[PDB]
């Protein structure tokens, strides 16, 4: 069989129609027909070979909502049926047997979990992934907006799990873009007291409507100092460098500053600041198959969805440029056409 | 063909609908939609609340977009292909009646044609007469500008009618979709601004909008204490309140002005008007020139509605959000792939 895809033929290149033969389905593989595929900056990073391990032709896309079209020989009794609506996120394969995998922590597999993009992603009519990483979906989920929940959604949901966040938690979110807006929606659904930190507070009382209780300028020193010791958790979602110190001091005792933004400049973390408040600084990215399964359920039940905008896949290069130019409001989703 | 989201029956959900606009009229301008606000007048038209809806119905009348074509007679009318422009409640007027020829086109003697009726902005593209295609300042925020074309002009127009300046003392009844824009605009004009609010929990938020004072509209004695203190009071709510304390809150020569379409007729004692040389007035949307001026003023003063974004592909969710009373404070659709 041939698979029709949109591929980059060189680093930073525009995507071209590219047919490839995937060969026979591996025993653990599931083949999925793409209905929708989100785009995020990680696709751009891979297209651009920002991280140095891209291989060309490169088929990106890792935020897929689609339907099962075929099951490998060892995936025929793994809870999935042909026709079933499913999702595929950033990861497609893990080893299964290392301590991380066998304990249900497959995203941390010791061999390095395999990105979906590496075995050819969702910017295509079809893709394949290991059955463990093919996420079953709730019957009533909104499929047009669900794709980014698999990348951005799980990225901001995971710290809520790691730090045992409940409705009485006081949580701050730095950045109100693609990731930040989903974090605010999820926190609001959890009943938490939510503060957003943004660049432009007055031109974002919109953020209050998203689910924030309070909105503060992310650089305003007096505002930030006044919040000393107030927060159980502050999630950083931006990948630029800020003065982090006031945010560390805004943590209550036992509080956590948690970055899901891949800030390039290392955080400067004074031991005394950690010591004085029994504070922690941590990080994470995407989650396990179980966490993904749980998030999609929670989002469907709570009626939480990312703010998306649809592009036809036939205009995928326009869609990518839209994301590059910072125009996404807030997550671009491709519709397979 | 133009792809749109249309209601097929009164109160129905919107469905993808293609219609043929025919050849561009000589005075028309075709606009590609980038954003379109939603307000309750879209809902009233979808629901046929007023009895003159025609189905299939393409609503939407708060459009920010770009010129994609100029009619033959609209080629030298200040607009260029690619230019960012707005279309509000109105799409056409006759041009030749006393109202139109004098620069009062919204008061067209024949009835100015609503954008909806002409096929509206819940679509990839729409058309309007070039006079009603409002040019925009280069630096305006386009994502939030849409509702200025309807809600904005609605609360701006009484400021023009009553010659409001920074020395004016102005009250605003209601701090929802219309009230919040009124407060922001009045603050940008330097006025002394009082908000009359039914929700005591929103007081700090309303102060933050630009109100100098917030008064509990459910407290009869707070209102009575304000006798004779206001030059203008703008009603933005569409429910029947006791208007009398607000009439009495007007100074001599003062004005009560409703932009709320209250269904219970206002009870207006002649003696109250007489004793203070007071007036009760109303209005809705404005002329092309007033719209042009409002958008310039809003962009320069950085006044923008507080908006909530949905893609147009989620228009039925967005409409339900507005129906359920959740708008905080104006819902805007972002145009996206229409299949
Ligand atoms: Zn492993
Ligand atoms: Zn992603
Ligand atoms: Zn309107
Ligand atoms: Zn006329």
Residue numbers in the entry:
A (entry chain A): 2 to 338
B (entry chain B): 3 to 341
Give excerpts from the publication.
The E. coli YjgB (EcYjgB) was crystallized in the monoclinic space group, C2, and its crystal structure was successfully determined at 1.55 Å resolution. The NBD (nucleotide-binding domain) was shown to adopt a canonical Rossmann fold that was composed of alternating beta strands and alpha helixes, which can hold cofactor NAD(H)/NADP(H). As in other Zn-dependent CAD and SAD families, PDBePISA (Proteins, Interfaces, Structures, and Assemblies) analysis showed that this Rossmann fold can form a dimer. The structure of the dimeric interface showed that dimerization region I (residues 268–270) and II (residues 280–284) establish the dimerization interface by generating two β-sheets.
Escherichia coli possess strong alcohol dehydrogenases that could contribute to producing alcohols through a designed pathway. These powerful enzymes, including YjgB, YahK, and YqhD, show nicotinamide adenine dinucleotide phosphate (NADP)-dependent activities for a variety of aldehydes. YqhD belongs to the family III metal-dependent polyol dehydrogenases, while YjgB and YahK are classified as members of the cinnamyl alcohol dehydrogenase family. As predicted from sequence alignment, the EcYjgB structure was found to belong to a typical cinnamyl alcohol dehydrogenase (CAD) family and sinapyl alcohol dehydrogenase (SAD) family, which consists of a nucleotide binding domain (NBD, residues 165–286) and a substrate-binding domain (SBD, residues 1–164 and 287–338). It was found that the catalytic Zn2+ ion is coordinated by the tetrahedral combination of Cys41, His63, Glu64, and Cys152, which were well conserved.
